[PDB]
Structure formats: C-alpha cells, structure tokens
Design a protein around this ligand. Structure first.
Ligand code: HEM
Ligand code: HEM
Ligand code: HEM
Lengths: 725, 723, 306, 83
C-alpha cells in the first residue's frame, strides 16, 4: 500500500526523453524490444510483483524489520537463520573488479551487414545481409576503478560480444587506433605506471602523475597513443560520439583458405564530438556517472546509439608495402593509403535489467574468434590471448564463467569439459572423454569447411630462432605522432598542447618534465616549444636542431585523424538547457520546443528552485532541475526565452550558467530581454555563436540548431581567456 | 572410433547385467517435479558437434597448435588453453566432514495429515508428493576414501516443499559424541588424520581420537554405537536414520510439540562383521556407492519410514536425562516412534559432481510448522552449514546451483554475489519501497502459506559459558545400549574396542579408556582389558554401575538383530560355476532367487563363457578373485564337473571367506565334497544348505537363512578356521 | 593430563612402532638444512602458551558456547565460538586435479662432481654443493583420501632450492607417459578417473572408460605395460625408480646445448608388491606408503636416490 | 572470508597481533603458520593440554562475558522504547 495513488512511481514503457521519468530496467522500460540473446535470457529473469518475500530457500518471511532476540531488548540469537542468510549474502556481494577497464557501461543491441562478405571471409555473421546477430556492448575507461568518474582524460574501451550462429566473437577495441606498447610482456609495467602510485594509491582516473610520465619518457613507443590521449580524443562527449578500433591487424579467411589482413573500425553515425578539458574535469565533480547516464537515457529515449563496422583490407602480398610494420600496434594504417569499406550496422536498442548480473559479470576475450577469422603475430595481441581467459578464474570465480547467463552463447555448445566451481550444466553423456565408443564418440569433431566447419588455424609460415628480441621494423616512434599532430585543426593542436602542459605541471620531479619535452622536440618543434613555454622550460640549440621524422608513405597529413576537420555532426539526442523565469513568454517557449522536437533535440527546463512556474499566458511549466542542480556542463546548448528577465537577471547561478556555457564554447541563444545577458559574457552587434532575436523567430531556432550541428563554436577560443569562469 | 553393445537398456536390470548409466538415460520415465525442473540444465551429447565453451566447432581435438609438426606450442592456441584451463580448475574443496557420500533422487509422502501437531505443508496432506534428494555419507574420510569403514554414517534428506526447502540432516545413530557445538573442531581434529603425518584415513583407530574420548566421557555413548556393528552397515538401505536433536513441531494454534525424527529401513537393519568390512575397503572401496546405484537401477528402491518420537511441552523434565542433551537417546520403550510417511529413492543422478558433490544441506533450512530447541550442539550447527558453503561452493549464490534450487517460488531483495544467475527486474533492491509498491512483500504467519515466525519460548538466565549440570551424566545410556545387544553383538563391541585400542601407540591411553568402560559395564570392561593384556584393579572391579534409564533394564529397538526385520529383495548371491554345470540345479536356483527378487552373479576361474551339460551357454559375471565373497550375501554351488573347481585355491578360499563371515552357503550334489574345506561334519550344520539336487526344499532353506542375514550360531566354530 | 612418566617420543632415531610419530622439528631438531632453517619464522610452538583467539585474546572456557542461561539459546555475540567454527568451516582447499594422494619429506642433494662442461646450472657447479630439496611422492588417479597401495603410476616431484632459483623436477616412476600431446591430457585423465555419472571407481584403471580410451588410442600402450607390471605397485617410494620422461636441454657457459633425460635410482633398489597383496593392503592399511616413508625417516633408514 | 580469501586473514601482516596467538585452529587457504603441536585438539594429554585456558583475572586473564540477566520470549520485535 506504499505506492502513490496517481501511479507516479511507475515509469511509462514508452520512449521518453532524458529526465521525463524514472529510468527502469530495459525489459520493463521496453518490453517489446527483442533479439535472440535477450529472448534466451527470459529463463533467468526474476520478477517481483505479487510475490511473497522469502529466503533463498523459498521460505516466506513474516517480519523483515527485526532480528530474533531473547526478549524485546534482548541479545540476538545464533538460531536466526533468516537474519544470517540475509547478512551473509550482503557480506559477499562484491567480486573483484577488472584489473583494467573496471569502469564501464553496457547495452544490448543487434548487428547486420550490408552485404555478404563471403568472398573474403567465411564467418557466418558476415555471410548474409539478412543475418541479424545479437550483441552486448560495454564501453569503459581504462585506469580507474568501477567507482571512478566517466569524463576523465583516459583511453575508452569499445568491446563487442557478437552472439553468432557459429560461436561468440568478442571484438575488444579501444577508441584510438593504436596502443601505448609494442609487446604484451610490458603490459603490467605500463599499466602499473598509469595506475595510482603503489605507496599512497593516488591518483584515480588520471595519467597526470610522475610514474606515468617517467615511463612514457623512457619508452618512446608510447608517444603515439599519448598524443591521442592528450588530444580531445581523450575526453569524448559521449560513447555514441567516439570512434572504435580493433587496433591489431587480424586475418580474414575465406572458403579457399585465402587470408586477408584486416583492421576493424567502428564509425559513430552520430559523429565524433568531444568535451574540452576544463568542462570534462569539472563534470567528474558535477556528474561522475555522466557517460553511463547519457547512454542509458539515449536508449530509453529511442536515440539508439548506431555504429558502422568498417574494414581496412590489405592483401597478404602487400604485407611489407608500408613504411611501418602492420604487426606493430603503435602504428595506425592511414585512411589515405588504405580506406575503410563499410561492412555493417550495429544498433544498441535496450538497456540491461541488472547492471551487476549483465554488465559487471560480462566477460570479453579477444581470443574468442570464429571460423573465418584468425590472429597475426602482432606481439601485443599474441600476449592478450593468454590474459583474458586467465583473469576470469579469479574475477568470475572459476572456469564456468561461460555459464553465467550474459556470457552464454545462443548457438549450441557441447564438449568433454566437466565440473569446476558453480557448475550449472548437468551432462548426461556417458563419456567425459574422446575418443570414446560408449557414446559413439559424440560429441564429434567437424572438419573445416565453408559453412558450419570446425575451426582450423591459417597455416602461416614460421622461420627463425627462439628469441626474446624486438623486431628492428618496430624501432621508429616519432613519425605517427607527427602524422597525427599535422592532421589536427589548429584549435585541436592547442588543446593537445594544453593537455601535455596541464598533466606535466602535475609532475613533481622537473627532470621528468624536461625529458618528456625532449621527446616532443623529436615529433614537432612547434608543439615542443608551446609545451616548454607553459612549463617555463627553454629548448637548447641541440633540441632546436632535431630533424623532423619521415612522413608516413609521403603523407603530409590525413584528416580522418581529426575529430572535426571534416564535419559529421548530427543533433539528434543532444540536450539544451532552457533557463526559465517566473513569467516566461509562452510564444518563445512554444516555438523553441517544436523546433527541437522536430530535430529530435531534448530540452531540460531549469529554474532557481524546483516545482512549477507559470508562463505569461497561464501555462503551468514543471521544473526539471535547478541551475546548480543541472549545470551547463551537462548540456550541449543554452536557450534563454523572454519574460520577466528581471527575475533571474541578478541571479548568481543563472549568470554563471551562461559564462560556464560560453567558456566551454557552447551555442547560446537569447530572445527579447534575454539579450541583456550579453553583458555578463562581455559580448552588442553580437557575435558568431550567440543567437539573438526580438523573439524565438524560427530563423532563430534554425541558427541555433545549425550551430549545434557543428558541436562547438571554435571561432570563440580567442575571447575565452578573458572570461573568469 | 565408433560403437560396436556399449548402450544399456532403459529398463530395470540386475547388478552387472548391463553397464551403469546416468539416471535420466537409464530410467527416463522416472519423474518428480524436482527431476523435471532440472531439464533446464541437462546437456545432451548425441549427434552434437564438439565445440569450445563459446560454441565454436573444433576441427582437431587430438593436437596442440605448433610451429611445424615437431615445433613449439603456440600461445595463440585458445582451444588448447580453454580445455586445459577448465581441466586445471575442476576441483572444489570437499566437505570438512562427510566428504565421502552417495546420493539419489526420490519422493516422500505422508500416510496421513499431521495438521494436529504441525502446520508444515509437506506433512499436511497424504496425497501431496514431495520430491527428495538424499546423500548418505561417512564422516571422517576424504571424498576418495572407502565406503565400508568403521565410522558414523550421515543420512541427509532435502525436501523440496511447496513452502520451502526442508533439510533433515541426520546420522545413522540416535546420539552424537559431544554436547556443545563449541567442541566440534576439537572432536573432529582428534578423529581426523593426525596433523603431522596425515594418518590414518577413515579410521578412529589412532591415539588422538582415544585420547579425546578418555578425557571427554560425554563421548562414550556414540563411541559404543561406533564400536558396535552399527559402525559398519551392510548397505545404506539397511541402516536407521536419526535427527538426533529434540526439535519442535508448531501447529496452527501455536501449540509446540517436541519431536525426534526417525528413518526406519523397510529393507531392515543389516551390518557387516569387522574383518569383512576392513577387507572390503581393499577389494571394493566403492561398495556402498555401487550397491546403492545398482539397487536403484535394479528397481530395488531404498525405502524408509519417517518416524516421530513426540513429547508434549509439559513433559520436558519427565525423564532422568535432559531432552536437549544430544548424547542421550529417548528409548522407544518410554516414547514410541509413530510412523509418519514413506520415502522412496527411485532414480540416480546424471552427473555426480553436478548433483552430489555440489549439493548443500543445512539443519537451519526449516519450514513454518517446525522450529529448533536450545540443544547446544544444534544451536552451533545453525551457523556452520551456511558459513562453510561460502568457500566450498564459491559464494552466497549456492542456492542457484540447480540441485539446490527450490521448486517453490523464491523472491527477495538479495542482490549480486559471485556467479549470480538470477537477473532481477525489480526496480527496488530494498524494502520498504514505494517504487515497486513494496513487492516482494512480507506474509503474516497463519495455518497455511504464512511467513515463518519463531515459537515464543521463554528465556531466563545470565549470559554464561556454562554446561547444564543436567548434561553431566555419561554412563547410563552407554550401559543401556550394551545390555540391549545380543551376546554376539556384545562380542562384536568388545572386538571393536579391542582392535582400535590395539592400534593405540601410547598404552596409558589404552588403560584410560578401559577405566571409562568400567563405569559402564565391568563385563565389557574386563573383556576389552584381557584382549589388551590390561588387568583391572580392585578399585575398578568395585566401581558401581550407572543407574537405569527411567527403570529400563534393556530396550530391544537398540539392537540391529534382537527383533528380526530382514527382507531378502535386492540381496545378491554368488553362484560358483564349473565347466559342465548341471542345468537342472541352475534352472531351479535362478527361479527361486527371481521369485524373491534376489540377484545372482555367475563366477568362474576365468571370464567369458562355460557350457552347461544341456548345452546352455553361461556368460561369466566375474572371477572368484574379481568378485570375492565379501561382495555377496550368500554363496551357492550347483553340481556338474565339480572336479574342475575342487582343487582350485580361489574356489576353496571363496567358501572359507564366506563361512568365516558367517554367510549362508548352499551346496548341491557333489559340491558337498566342499564341506571338507570348511571342516563341516557329514551331518552338516545350520547355515550350510545341502542336498542331492537344488530342489524346492533346498532353495527355501537358503532363502530363510538369507532373511536372517547371517548365521550367528557359527561364531564358536569360526576362530579355528584360517581365512 | 600427561602421564607422570612422560611416556606421552624421544628426540632420537627409533625403529617403526617403538614410539609415537611426531612432527619433524620435534623428532629430529638437530637435522637442519638452509630451507628448514628459513622456515623457523613461521613455525608455531604450543608449550607454555595461553590458548587464544586469532586476535591474541586469551580464552577462559573452551568447552562451552555463550548462552542465555544454562540451557539457553546460543548468542550471536559469541565471537570466540564463531571464530573457531568459521576457521574449521574453512579448513579445506581444492585437492590436486591429479596426484591428489601424496607423501613428502625434506632432504638435500649434492653433485658428485662439477658439471660445468655441460651445464651452467649453479646447483650442479661444484662437488658436494648442498641444495635443500622437498620431495612429494604420489599416485595419480586417487583423491587425497584414497589408498597408497593402488595399481597406478607414482609421482616423483622434487623441489630444489638453488642459489639461482627454484628448480622443480616433476617426474614419474616410469620413463614414459600415456599420451603424446598435452591437448589430450584431459581426455586421458577423464578416462582413468572415476566415471562421471556415479564417480566409480576410486584409484583404479580397472573400468570400462580407461580401457575404451586405451583401445582407441594405442600410443597409450607403452605406459599401460609398465602399469600392468609390478612397477604399478611399488613396495615403497624408497624402492622405485624416478624419471623426468621428457628430453630437456642442458646449456653450458659456451652456449652449447646437450639433450638430457633425468633418472632417479633408488639406493635401496627396486622392489614391488604382488597384486593380491597390494589390493588387500588398500584395505588393511590404505596409508601404508605414507606410514612407511615417515617411519623410515624416524628410523634413520633415509630414502636415498642417485 | 570472501574479501581476504579465507580464514587465515589474521596472518596477513598488517592484521597480525603483536601479542602471542596460539590455538588449535589448523589449515585454511594460504596457511602461513606451521604448527608443531602434536595435538590439534583439546583436551589433550599428548601435549599436556597446551596451549591452555586462562582463568579470568584482573590482569592477563581469560575473556569471560559479563553475566547479564536475560528475561524475555524469543521474538523478532522492536523495543517500543525505540519508536
Ligand atoms: C590494443 C591493446 C588492448 C586493447 C584494445 C584492450 C582492450 C580491452 C578492453 C576493451 C577491455 C575491457 C573489456 C570489458 O569491457 O569487459 C580490456 C580488459 C582487459 N584487458 Fe585489455 N586491451 C589491450 C591490451 C591488453 C593487454 C596487453 C593485456 C594483458 C596482457 C590486457 C589485459 C586485459 C585484462 C586482464 C582485462 C580485464 C579482463 C576481464 O576481466 O575481462 N589487455 N582490454
Ligand atoms: C547432530 C550431530 C550431527 C549430525 C547428524 C550432522 C549431520 C551432518 C551430515 C549428514 C552432513 C553431510 C551433509 C551432506 O551430505 O552434504 C554434515 C556435514 C557438516 N556438518 Fe554436520 N552433523 C552433526 C554435527 C555437526 C556439528 C556440531 C557441526 C558444527 C559446526 C557440523 C557442521 C557440519 C559441516 C560444516 C558440514 C559440512 C557442510 C557442507 O560442506 O555442506 N555438524 N553434518
Ligand atoms: C610426463 C607427463 C607428466 C608427468 C611426469 C607429470 C608429473 C606430475 C607430478 C609428479 C605431479 C604431482 C606434483 C605434486 O606432488 O604436487 C603432477 C601434478 C599435476 N600435473 Fe602433471 N605430469 C605430467 C603430465 C601432465 C600434463 C600433460 C598436464 C596438463 C596438461 C599435467 C598437469 C598437472 C597438474 C594440473 C597437476 C596438479 C599440480 C598442482 O596442482 O600443483 N601433467 N604432475
């Protein structure tokens, strides 16, 4: 009898925009949204409604408020089995977090290819355009714990579990196309350096400390993935607005046994967008769950995250054609030399029911491949194949982690494997070995073949001695950092300079700072000088004379490496803050919202207090948040309609919201008297990125939506140093 | 690689007739709701592709991936590593105690409603059928230890009731060694293999156990049961089950009745003798596990009658022992056992590790209509059984292991933990909550489908670590047990003590235990001391015997054999063949055995076939050494070319072993020559069935003895025979 | 509670059955090597100590639970009982997947002379150089609670504590193994192990699935011959041979490689049981090999291998 | 038990007592203490019952609970004095 009579506790099982309703588990939120993986999970879902509360043994509980005691004011009794089971289960809730990418957010989806790829690979999931494969995707950061913030400067993980007809395929990618290290053997050294320092366990979610920059300074192979990290790539606006990459070269194998080299790409259909550092660092304070929240809400809204799977393809005879080793994971393949051809579409359309059961327990391993794919001798990748199965024995508590429901294949699985902790499968097979006659040798081996064949490795030639030795072909470190750098817009280049500058400023030992700078002189002198000047370091004459590295196969730049050089903006799923007053002009707010709804743009209505305001025309407006409660940090744009502006004109928080939005390069739109706010951000004829008009004209809504399509107002950067926000 | 048959018939068949099989293959039509609920996780094999755990088809399961045929193995072989990793991580910790056990599926039903004394749903209606799963066990030994040890036996029954799981976790003796749960590790450490060298396995015959017994006389009553033939049962189907503690029944009015739980074997009580049991640990360490599985495949279903001893609340102080003391039994002469229901075990599991090894029982798992008492052994147990499952089964979700799951509904606010299977869709993981209208909801207690509520027992005392003075009497229940045994059972108890103390290295420990036995019965004390070369002092001979228990001079329910209860069905006979069997004799034996449901094994000096005189071909089940007399209930020899096996050492020893072990022996025709090997007079003797042919008379004789289980009149003769 | 005459073992070598067996440091305190000495920091005594909780709190009464009166319910606040039962409830760890049944002892190794010409392994570098060892002998199929004198292969695992690192020579009492490729170890082990439906039989290869696999995989037949022989039932761990089985390499200062196979030769020689005797012994004393090893060392009849 | 992986968490060094700790507890995952006590149980005569119970005393005594009087019925009930 505790629920409200108006039924305001329950959300609607309808797509609703962010903040409209309580968020719910996905099967309640969207019961009609289905795929084969999600239908297969019905057998393990527990309901709640109209159920007696029980122990795990099915015994109904009379009193869930009290321990059993020898009297009212008595001591608690050992015999209280209901108390102890409840506490015992609570005391054992936690399991070890992932050693890396502990922080992650996940959703169910489906994948479909555009056309049969059966010419280049015999993988069943790429075999036909009508073949629809369920996926589960987890996006993550890298350094921080499960309880760390989302919008840190870090790499992001992009791992995809394809539940195919011929097995699970895990594509375990990152949001940059390279990694920091060449050889798996040094993964703990590099991960120990970026991680919090072992004496005092500081700092969390930050590469900005001494041990990371010490390692980078002594291992220049790192410098290419560090540039990406120090770029706006390091702080994305959303998981929906970043690129995914496989990073390693892998193989495709077709029915003839012909092997094609591949690199995997995810391209975001919503386009690439990133935060700026001041905004990102502050947002870890205002909303540490910002990416996790944004993603759940985009999906509850129907703003389904969409990505296009892309292949970079290289014939086997083309292995040595480039200036870099294809097996080197610190080098990218420029899109200018090898294009991405579109392979398929992935759509994330449903949230999970239980984060711990589905996200936290989900296990990806890049070793999970299917017939039609295969590895290469990329010596980072070779090392990963051992690690992902080893870690699950402790993290998921045994070798039966595949029987945990999220991890189960939809396709059939039968073998002679037996027992292990938390064994779920009860095998009826008389034989637990092959060859056997007592079960006629079932289940049986399948020979390799074009469809439904057994897995067989590509018969790659191996010649050479047993050595622990780095290929000399890997021993070039500066030319790809340089290609990346020259491919960036000038405003991206300052953001990179500022990232290096900020992080190095945090480094306590100055010699570590000086060595990182000396490494930068080897990539480009302009970038190297701009950092030295922010650190009060002066380049020597030797440093000034360092010859630039070769370009990569004759390229001066590649613009596919920039987030913004070629615009790809889509406003659908973006959010505007609307700053109300106590007597809002109804005409302005009516026009504003119908323009946003038309382009799938969301709004939140903000005031100095919660509850309701009334517009000039009597309309009751409910309030989503306070100006302090949902700061500018959390929106793409700000719109102030006309009304009793006097009401908010001297409001400290209302003026700061405009200044915070303005400093962070966001579009700002002012109608009527709202223009008087132009004084707080020191703007009168007006400027690019401030939309102003007598009323929210509809041309006014067109100017604002056009700016939102370009994501930020880069022209504004020269003005923001003056503004104290 | 293929099949020839390999496959057993899915029909009841006698032991050794066919290969053993998972229960669902062997008897697919044998069903209960628990067995049907497990279909979710049964995995088949026939006509399936072999795969990885991720569902990827394997082309070559004979080879590692390597750089050249003769090259090193590659790190990138994920098929090899997955298969090796699963193999490397197969084992889990075994149970601290009762590590050795054997399990089967079954159903229980009441004879009649007990709503008068309990509101427990599973006893509520005689047409409600409750699925059970039962594990029998030894106590001391590892999972890899022998079945027929001298130990206590565990009898754990899990009832899947409509209002929750009820676990009745009992032993095959009505008492336990210790009074307070605080001393369980000291007692178990003392009986377990000694910590320095980890010797011996499945045996109490070592110093640290008898040292603890000598300093803790509360132990002596359960020691008496252990040193008796109760310690070495013939089969799990032929032993008694006890709850041991006083417990409560709660009815709809809230009236509390004290209860003790009993299991009564319908196959009756049968035990081995010590020399046979000790040797059977060598020839077949799996003899109880095996006897059980085949008995069920044969269709000889283990059957038990649930029994209540019931004491009204006002009678709590009416005995001269304390009801909450678990070293005291309630004699059936003072309080009779009321038949409540029948339990039938009618199907083996499919996978031993999946179902037996991961099964979790707890005496705390009770249902509304039951409750506990302040028995301080039981009070401690309640904590332990949940605690131990966290490490043994890898977390607090052990109830989602399929054998463990309730058949009834289970919904709560519990979340996460290792290997979480249940995905909760409830918006709320707390109560009280408005966001789900407080679902799942508490239920008030009532006559049926009510929430559990403890009986409102009055507690008055100070917080003390104190043993009740009412517990401090230790000898009268050991003496009541001793005086209730047949002389030959008393002789066996003397021998158990004699044999185990004879293995005790420190004599002062052997003399100490002899002193405790003097406080129980001086006849028993003087028989043991003579076997150890100890001599009782005057002080000892003048020790006053303990009181009677409530004027009881003996209780015959305490003896295995004092009141016959034997049923031959499911017993096996050994038939010793010769190369020309007289078909007449064999025809008549098999027809008489079959009509009484007695199984036979045909044995020869070699495997394969022999031919009877009328040309029938007999397959041979085992050789004489391959299946020794240890493994059968009696031995039959039919006629034929007896000369063939007359000089055979193994054929002669088989009878000498059986004879020493007091087993009935049947000789037909010329097989009477064999009476020379066992030094029997021409006239013959009781226990040796003889005749010119195996007539109707001859088989009646054999089957009547088999009903009395052993030939006890033989004992005076057995000391002279070497075997 | 001890007898006044102190007959509750002498710290000198004594023959089997003479005295009660004891922990090694009590039985033979003057027997030392460097590994045993390094273990002193974790050795716990007992005489003269108060019985305490793990937190060092002295226990007054270790015979009783704390209860609400004499015949009262036991109380949750009894931290002394809960710590004791909890530790007891958590004594067991998983056994070895294979060779779960095993018996071990401390020892030492010296090389007769330097082997510098063929290997640069420090523990083989100078004559009479003492390396401590720890040796575990084992069956293969049985669990930790299974019998010693089964018909099986035997394990001969040696841990060498060398100046340049731990070397583990993990050997068997026959010089070959059942199978050629590690990919099939789980197949072979599931075959010889107790059968999955009913977990029968323990410590024996005498069942259908073992011989069905042997019949379909003839590479197994050479080790099956050794197992079906009296090698399968040693009289003692002191009386069996040891083998590394694999070819390894020795590498010397010059970088020259020499192929090598490892042998242990028992100085007490080769002796075995006979099957009827060994099968009965699993009954009369399933701890016979464990007991004999321990008493041989208490007696001073030390297992010696070359 | 789950968090520090077994019943021997008191032997993790930061957790260790500086005072003496001796009992009959044995085994458990990652057991560090090698016990030399011939007895793993009490009462024992084989080690003369070491280590031993200490009677409660003003200094260095055994722990004994304060003998608080308990009078009530077994209830899951909240004291009305709490509400
Ligand atoms: C290009 C290089 C790498 C990429 C792109 C990569 C990617 C990822 C991703 C996306 C995850 C998170 C999966 C999830 O969301 O659950 C992850 C986790 C992990 N990675 Fe990596 N990784 C790389 C290199 C390595 C290396 C070299 C190692 C170790 C040898 C390693 C060990 C792990 C481990 C242990 C986890 C946690 C495993 C688990 O609990 O599931 N990674 N990696
Ligand atoms: C009344 C005397 C006792 C009886 C009849 C009894 C009965 C049983 C039985 C039948 C089992 C095996 C259950 C199975 O097959 O899984 C068992 C196991 C066990 N008992 Fe007892 N027990 C008694 C006393 C105690 C005491 C005093 C303790 C004290 C803590 C205790 C703790 C345990 C533990 C920890 C297990 C292992 C649980 C597991 O791994 O599932 N028992 N007991
Ligand atoms: C020539 C072949 C082999 C020999 C001589 C051999 C020898 C041994 C020995 C002596 C032990 C017992 C060590 C101890 O006392 O604790 C042992 C244990 C073991 N062996 Fe083997 N083994 C062989 C092949 C294999 C193979 C092929 C595998 C796996 C692919 C394997 C896996 C194991 C495992 C998992 C254990 C348990 C060890 C532990 O838990 O620490 N063995 N082996």
């Amino acid at each position: 009898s505790l629920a409200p009579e108006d039924g305001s506790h329950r959300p609607a099982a309808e797509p609703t925009p962010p903040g409209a309703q309580p968020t719910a588990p996905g099967s309640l939120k969207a019961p009609d949204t289905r795929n084969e993986k999600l239908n297969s999970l019905e057998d393990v879902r527990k309901g709640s409604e109209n159920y007696a509360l029980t122990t795990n043994q099915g015994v109904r509980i009379a009193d869930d408020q009290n321990s059993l005691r020898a009297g009212n004011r008595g001591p608690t009794l050992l015999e209280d089995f209901i108390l102890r089971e409840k506490i015992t289960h609570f005391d054992h809730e936690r399991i070890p977090e992932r050693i890396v990418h502990a922080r992650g957010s996940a959703a169910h989806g489906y994948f479909q290819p555009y056309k049969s790829l059966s010419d280049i690979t015999k993988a069943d999931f790429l075999s036909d355009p009508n073949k629809i494969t369920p996926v589960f995707v987890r996006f993550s950061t890298v350094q921080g714990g499960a309880g760390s913030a989302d919008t840190v400067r870090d790499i992001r993980g992009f791992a995809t579990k394809f539940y195919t007809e011929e097995g699970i395929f895990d594509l375990v990618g990152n949001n940059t196309p390279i990694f920091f290290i060449q050889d798996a053997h040094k993964f703990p050294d590099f991960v120990h350096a970026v991680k919090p320092e072992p004496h005092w366990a500081i700092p969390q979610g930050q590469s900005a400390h001494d041990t990371f920059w010490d390692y980078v300074s002594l291992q220049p192979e790192t410098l290419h993935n560090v540039m990406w990290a120090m770029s706006d790539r390091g702080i994305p606006r959303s998981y929906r607005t970043m690129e995914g990459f496989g990073i390693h070269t892998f193989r495709l194998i077709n029915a003839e046994g012909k092997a094609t080299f591949v690199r995997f790409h995810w391209k975001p259909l919503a386009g690439k967008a990133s935060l700026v550092w001041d905004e990102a660092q502050k947002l870890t304070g205002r909303d540490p769950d910002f990416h996790r929240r944004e993603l759940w809400e985009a999906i509850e809204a129907g703003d389904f995250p969409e990505y296009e799977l892309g292949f970079q393809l290289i014939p086997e005879e083309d292995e040595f054609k480039f200036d870099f080793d294809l097996l080197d994971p610190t080098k990218l393949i420029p899109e200018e030399l090898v294009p991405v051809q579109r392979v398929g579409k992935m759509v994330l359309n449903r949230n999970p029911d239980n984060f711990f059961a589905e996200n936290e327990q989900a296990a990806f391993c890049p070793g999970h491949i299917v017939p039609g794919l295969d590895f290469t001798n990329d010596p980072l990748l070779q090392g990963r194949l051992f690690s992902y199965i080893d870690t699950q024995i402790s993290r998921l508590g045994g070798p039966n982690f595949h029987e945990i429901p999220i991890n189960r294949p939809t396709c059939p699985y039968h073998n002679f494997q037996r027992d292990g902790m938390h064994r779920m499968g009860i095998d009826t097979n008389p034989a637990n070995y092959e060859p056997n006659s007592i079960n006629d040798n079932w289940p049986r081996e399948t020979p390799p073949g074009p469809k439904r064949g057994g897995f067989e490795s590509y018969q790659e030639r191996v010649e050479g001695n047993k050595v622990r030795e780095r290929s000399p072909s890997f021993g070039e470190y500066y030319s790809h950092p340089r290609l990346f750098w020259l491919s960036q817009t000038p405003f991206e280049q300052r953001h990179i300079v500022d990232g290096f500058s900020f992080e190095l400023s945090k480094v306590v030992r100055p010699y570590i700072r000086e060595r990182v700078v000396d490494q930068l002189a080897h990539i480009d002198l302009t970038l190297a000088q701009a950092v030295a000047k922010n650190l009060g370091i002066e380049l020597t004459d030797d440093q000034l004379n360092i010859t630039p590295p070769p370009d990569v196969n004759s390229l001066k730049k590649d613009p596919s490496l920039s987030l913004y050089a070629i615009p790809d903006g889509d406003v659908k799923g973006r959010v505007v803050a609307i700053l109300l007053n106590d007597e809002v002009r109804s005409a302005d707010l009516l026009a504003i919202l119908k323009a946003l709804k038309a382009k799938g743009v969301h709004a939140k209505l903000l005031y100095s207090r919660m509850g309701e305001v009334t517009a000039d025309d009597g309309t009751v407006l409910p309030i989503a948040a306070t100006f302090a409660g949902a700061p500018s940090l959390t929106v793409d744009a700000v719109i102030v309609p006309c009304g009793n502006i006097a009401d908010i004109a001297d409001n400290g928080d209302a003026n700061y919201y405009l200044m915070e939005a303005y400093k962070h390069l966001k579009p700002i739109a002012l109608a009527g008297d709202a223009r008087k706010f132009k004084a707080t951000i020191k703007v009168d004829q007006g400027e690019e990125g401030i939309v102003e008009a007598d009323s929210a004209d509809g041309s006014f809504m067109d100017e604002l939506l056009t700016l939102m399509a370009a994501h930020r107002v880069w022209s504004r950067i020269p003005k923001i140093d003056k503004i104290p926000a």
